[PDB]
Structures are given as structure tokens and as C-alpha cells.
Design a binder for this molecule. Structure first.
Ligand SMILES: OC[C@H]1O[C@H](O[C@H]2[C@H](O)[C@@H](O)[C@@H](O)O[C@@H]2CO)[C@H](O)[C@@H](O)[C@@H]1O
Ligand SMILES: [Mg+2]
Ligand SMILES: [Mg+2]
Length: 484
């Protein structure tokens, strides 16, 4: 990570061009260049690159992923003065609190709404159950009732939760991480309704974000389900749209998981004070939020002064009505595993590859498998932590003409280093020095036990994959694997 610069990652559906304008302003006032990027699969790429000490200075995502990042030591604890904290709503700070510590800046509150074409559908349905017959009628005029992103469980969750689906049971001030709530009658009823929509040819299992967006914005489908960020592209389209409450299911509201768009600081960033000043004094201002919101709407913003104006928008009022019917997502480390499990179940049921019963029955197991991989990847990141220390040791004693000591050709104890999950030591000969990290035979993931990561050290300190590595390739940072 470059010192004296700011690299920002934010998802491609957000107002990153508007964010870059706030960036350019910061660059004018400070001389600090700000670069805004939007990598695909950003929320999965960041933990990998941050593990090797690289990545963005600042990462934006909904708050649900941040407990996982914090747990893996990837986030800097944030430190705003109480005067600043008073500028944002209290419940938004709560969303970014993990283990007592604030782990990000809250930016905006997002919930899914029902978006409808007022010309096709002046009076949109209040119930999911009306939608099949509505589609049949619209098909006669060459239109469809509803299209939305079926590939991400975020979009199907409001229906799954309506009759009783839940992520983790909340009992006695804690989440029960072993009580996952998609293997119950309520979840099954919601997913069954969805699968029948596909079986009855009212929806296609392959519909994704782009397909649904293009169909709604071109007037081919009467309704879609999406968040505030989507409104901008509809604004530029011919469509006259309305934003309203999600349909009910079995007389109960759809319950979208509510996300707080948040900005965290990379633990490995050399630019932490700069990141803080950008976020506190440029982004989280009326002018800063407006710049982004003008690009792609944020929803209901955490900043009280600017949300004062936004709240008069009927679209934000619907956003907040849906948010209240739903629930704020947990931020616990198991959230990404939960999301992997629900994505898999929904897709397996959608495609017809598994029954709704079988798909949902496998979810907790699938979540566990995902979480075990997450733990192993986190533990493996220690090798790059230890190697970074050892790599400076390597360059300081290369002066003695060797990879070690003040001249030895065996590793001194000053060339070894102990870790929590394994030990690293310098190796090699001549100017081609290596670092080897060996996992313990127990007390670490059984995916990792007794395996080793072997790194070649360039003269410039860049670590590449040596073929002696037998730590599983899929648990290593992809950039490291690529160098192999
Ligand atoms: O689909 C699972 C996914 O849901 C949420 O992601 C949302 C995100 O919150 C929104 O800002 C927007 O980008 O759409 C995403 C879904 O495509 C969770 O935040 C995420 O962790 C989870 O994987
Ligand atoms: Mg008209
Ligand atoms: Mg059936």
C-alpha cells in the first residue's frame, strides 16, 4: 500500500464516480491523490489482499462483512471524537460496533423496496400471491410482472424471511451461531413460492442483476426489487417508476435484511490519519454525501444534517418503511458463511437440482464448511505477517554476505520466529533467500496442520510462491498463488 496516497474500494453498483469527485476535492486541498476502484467480488478480494498487507486504504461494504474482517485483524479501530459521533444516528454506530470497538464509519442505511412501472401497473400488488396471475395477464401483452436478481440471496431473503426464515437466532443478548433459521417451515414456504414462480414460467432461474435491471428499465417487466442505488439508472430511462412496500407473504410483510453501507480502514494502511480526515471531513459532510448520492442514491444516510433533506423523498420513506419491516443484519464473523449457504440453497432449489427441503436442510452444514475455510484462510495469513518481519531481517544480514547471522550458513535463532499457528524461518543460499512458514501439527485447522508455505524473497522484498509450498492453494491469497 502506497504511502501519501489513498486507494478506495467500493462496489460497482454504488456512486463511485461521485465518490471520486470527493476524492478530487481532497486532492486539491491536501495534494493527496485519491483513487477509487470497484473490483468485482470486492468483498471476497479484500480479505485476501489485506492478508498480504496490500489492498485499499479504505473499503466500503454493508456492515455485515466487517465483523469477519475485524476478527481476522484486517481493520483499524476507528477513533472519532464524540463531537463527530453525535453527527450520525446512534443505531448506525451500533451497526459498526464489534466486540466493544468501532470498526468502521457508517455511511447510509439500505433496504430493498418494490419498484414498479406506473404506466404498466398504476396499482401494484400488495401480496406475493397475486403475482403469478398478474404475470399471466401481462404475458398476453408481451410483458412480465416481476424480474429481480435471483443469483444473490440478498434479493430473495425478504420472501424467505416473511413467514419465519431467520439467519441466526438471537437469544440472551447473543447470536446462537448453531441455530440457523432456514431449515424451518417458514423459510421452506417462501422458497417454495419462489421455486413455483420459476416452474410456472413467471421467472427464469438464470435472471441476474443486469438482466432484471435492463428488463425493468426498458419497460419489459412491470416490477423489480432493488435498492436505492438502482434509482439513478431508472431516472435516465423512459420509465415512470414508483418505490413502495414489498409484497406480503401469507399476510406477513417481506422482511429485507437491512444493511448499513460502511467504510473501514485497512489495518495495513500507512495512510490511516489521511483516511480518517477524508472520511470525517470530506465524505461525511452535506456536500460529500450529496456528491455520491447524485451519482447513485445512498438511501437514508447516517449523517443527521443531510438525512434531514433526504427524508422528504417518498422513495426514501418507502426504503425506511421496508427497513422497519425487516431486520438489521448481524455483523458476526459467520455472516459470509451464512450468505454462502443461502446462495447455494436458493440456486440448488431454483435450478431444480434439489428439493426445497433438501436444499434448506443442507444449509447449516454448508455454512459450517464455508466458515471452516474462512478460519483456515485467516490463520494462514500469519505466514505473511511473520514473513514481513523476516524479510527485513534478510536484507539487514545480506550485508554480512549471507542469508543469515553475521555470516553463518546455518539459520541462527535470530533468523527464526514463532507464531500462534506455526513458525517461520529464513532459508536458501546466495542472494536467493527463502522464508518458510510451517504450521503446527495441531491447534490449527486440519486443512493446514503440518503444511508449509515457502516463499522466495526478491531483492526488493516481494514474496513469491516457492514450489515447496504444500499448504492448500485455495486457502492462500490468490495473488501469492498466481506468483507461483
Ligand atoms: O447476496 C448476499 C449479499 O447480500 C448483501 O450484499 C448486498 C449489499 O449489501 C448491497 O449494498 C448491494 O451491493 O447488493 C448486495 C447483494 O448483491 C451483503 O452485504 C453481502 O455480505 C452478502 O454477500
Ligand atoms: Mg404515462
Ligand atoms: Mg409444488
Amino acid at each position: 500500500i502506497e504511502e501519501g496516497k489513498l486507494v478506495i474500494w467500493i462496489n460497482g453498483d454504488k456512486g463511485y464516480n461521485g465518490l471520486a469527485e470527493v476524492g478530487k476535492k481532497f486532492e486539491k486541498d491536501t495534494g493527496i491523490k485519491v483513487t477509487v476502484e470497484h473490483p468485482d467480488k470486492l468483498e471476497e478480494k479484500f480479505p485476501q489482499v489485506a492478508a498480504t498487507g496490500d489492498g485499499p486504504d479504505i473499503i466500503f461494504w454493508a456492515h455485515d462483512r466487517f465483523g469477519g474482517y475485524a476478527q481476522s485483524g484486517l481493520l483499524a479501530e476507528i477513533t472519532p471524537d464524540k463531537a463527530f459521533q453525535a453527527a450520525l444516528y446512534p443505531f448506525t454506530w451500533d451497526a459498526v460496533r464489534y466486540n466493544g470497538k468501532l470498526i468502521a464509519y457508517p455511511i447510509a442505511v439500505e433496504a430493498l423496496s418494490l419498484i414498479y412501472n406506473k404506466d404498466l401497473l398504476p396499482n401494484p400488488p400488495k401480496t406475493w400471491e397475486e403475482i403469478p396471475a398478474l404475470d399471466k395477464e401481462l404475458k398476453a401483452k408481451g410483458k412480465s410482472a416481476l424480474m429481480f436478481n435471483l443469483q444473490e440471496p440478498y434479493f430473495t431473503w425478504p420472501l424467505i424471511a416473511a413467514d419465519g426464515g431467520y439467519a441466526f437466532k438471537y437469544e440472551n443478548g447473543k447470536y446462537d451461531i448453531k441455530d440457523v433459521g432456514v431449515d424451518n417451515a417458514g423459510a421452506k414456504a417462501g422458497l417454495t413460492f419462489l421455486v413455483d414462480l420459476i416452474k410456472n414460467k413467471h421467472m427464469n432461474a438464470d435472471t441476474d442483476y443486469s438482466i432484471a435491471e435492463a428488463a425493468f428499465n426498458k419497460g419489459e417487466t412491470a416490477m423489480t426489487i432493488n435498492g436505492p442505488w438502482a434509482w439513478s439508472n431508472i431516472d435516465t430511462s423512459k420509465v415512470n417508476y414508483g418505490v413502495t412496500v414489498l409484497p406480503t407473504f401469507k399476510g406477513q410483510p417481506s422482511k429485507p435484511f437491512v444493511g448499513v453501507l460502511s467504510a473501514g480502514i485497512n489495518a495495513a494502511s500507512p495512510n490511516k490519519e489521511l483516511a480518517k480526515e477524508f472520511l470525517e471531513n470530506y465524505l461525511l459532510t452535506d456536500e460529500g454525501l450529496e456528491a455520491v448520492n447524485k451519482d447513485k442514491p445512498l438511501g437514508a444516510v447516517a449523517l443527521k444534517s443531510y438525512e434531514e433533506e433526504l427524508a422528504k423523498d417518498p422513495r426514501i420513506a418507502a426504503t425506511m418503511e421496508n427497513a422497519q419491516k425487516g431486520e438489521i443484519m448481524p455483523n458476526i464473523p459467520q455472516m459470509s458463511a451464512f450468505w454462502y449457504a443461502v446462495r447455494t440453497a436458493v440456486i440448488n432449489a431454483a435450478s431444480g437440482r434439489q428439493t426445497v427441503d433438501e436444499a434448506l436442510k443442507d444449509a447449516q452444514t454448508n455454512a459450517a464448511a464455508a466458515y471452516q475455510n474462512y478460519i483456515a484462510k485467516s490463520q494462514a495469513s500469519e505466514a505473511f505477517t511473520l514473513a514481513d518481519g523476516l524479510k527485513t531481517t534478510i536484507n539487514t544480514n545480506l550485508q554480512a554476505g549471507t542469508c543469515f547471522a553475521g555470516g553463518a550458513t546455518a539459520v541462527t535463532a535470530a533468523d527464526k520466529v514463532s507464531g500462534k499457528y506455526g513458525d517461520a524461518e529464513i532459508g536458501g543460499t546466495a542472494p536467493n533467500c527463502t522464508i518458510t512458514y510451517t504450521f503446527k501439527s495441531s491447534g490449527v485447522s486440519n486443512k493446514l496442520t503440518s503444511t508449509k508455505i515457502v516463499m522466495n524473497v526478491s531483492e526488493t522484498g516481494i514474496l513469491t510462491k516457492n514450489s515447496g509450498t504444500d499448504t492448500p492453494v485455495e486457502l492462500l491469497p490468490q495473488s501469492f498463488v498466481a506468483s507461483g
